[PDB]
Amino acid sequence: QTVFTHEQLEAYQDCTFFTRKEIMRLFYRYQDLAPQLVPLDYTTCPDVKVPYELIGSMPELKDNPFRQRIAQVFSEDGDGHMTLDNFLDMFSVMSEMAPRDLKAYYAFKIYDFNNDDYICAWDLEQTVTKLTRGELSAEEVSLVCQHVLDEADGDHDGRLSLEDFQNMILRAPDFLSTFHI
């Protein structure tokens, strides 16, 4: 391994859910996104960002309806252009090892399309339309979002706080997760 110093690999393992072997694999994925831009020596702490377009188009994200928001939220400046640090943070949260309540924390940030710390009916409608791939009628999307609010809006102000949202997820385990390899 000639990319990082021992210390900086220990730090990545300390601040993500990944093993050293996983950090190395993901580094090479990141470098391969923009091979004429990303250097192969990170021991000098280069300041490098891969443009959003080359992140969102990667195989693991290109079909995710929230790829732009995901990259924005994890990017250093909120514009989707990502350092290696940002990239590893993103995939650490997306990994199998991340607790569900932690995924729910970042999902809130991603679905809060206007970054006002609430998921309102408009944020919900955008989210549900995206999640459902545009196959529901705008009229039916709106009705689904009404249902979610009636269930989860604990203080009846018509919108979901972070706590509203995380507790909704907590009460809804992923019963179909068993039947996947």
Q: Which residues pair with 119 in a beta bridge?
A: 160
Residue 69 counted as an annotated binding residue: no
| Angstrom distance (rounded) from CA 31 to CA 82 | 12
78: left (phi over 0), alpha (psi -120 to 50) or beta: left
| Angstrom distance (rounded) from CA 86 to CA 32 | 16
Shortest spacing between CB 158 and Ca ion, in angstroms: 6
By beta-carbon proximity to Ca ion, the closer residue of 89 and 123 is: 123
By beta-carbon proximity to Ca ion, the closer residue of 89 and 153 is: 153
With CB cut-offs between 5 and 8 Å by kind, which of a copy of itself, Ca ion, none does residue 149 bind? none
- Please give the structure tokens belonging to residue 9: 């690999």
With CB cut-offs between 5 and 8 Å by kind, which of Ca ion, a copy of itself, none does residue 155 bind? Ca ion
Phi, psi of 102 (to 5 degrees): -75, -40
Residues at the interface with a copy of itself (CB under 8 A): 25-26, 29, 60-61, 64-66, 70, 91, 93-96, 98-101, 103-104, 106-107, 110-111, 127-128, 131-132, 135-136, 140, 144, 147-148, 151, 165, 168-181
With CB cut-offs between 5 and 8 Å by kind, which of a copy of itself, Ca ion, none does residue 112 bind? Ca ion
Residue 114 counted as an annotated binding residue: yes
Residue 118 counted as an annotated binding residue: yes
Residue 159 counted as an annotated binding residue: yes
Which ranges in 4-152 belong to alpha helices (H)? 6-15, 20-33, 52-56, 67-74, 84-94, 100-111, 121-131, 138-152
Residue 85 counted as an annotated binding residue: no
Task: Name every residue whose Cβ is closer than 8 Å to that of residue 16 and which is 6 or more positions away in sequence.
Answer: 23, 88, 89, 92
Residues annotated in the binding site for Ca(2+), as ranges?
112, 114, 116, 118, 123, 153, 155, 157, 159, 164
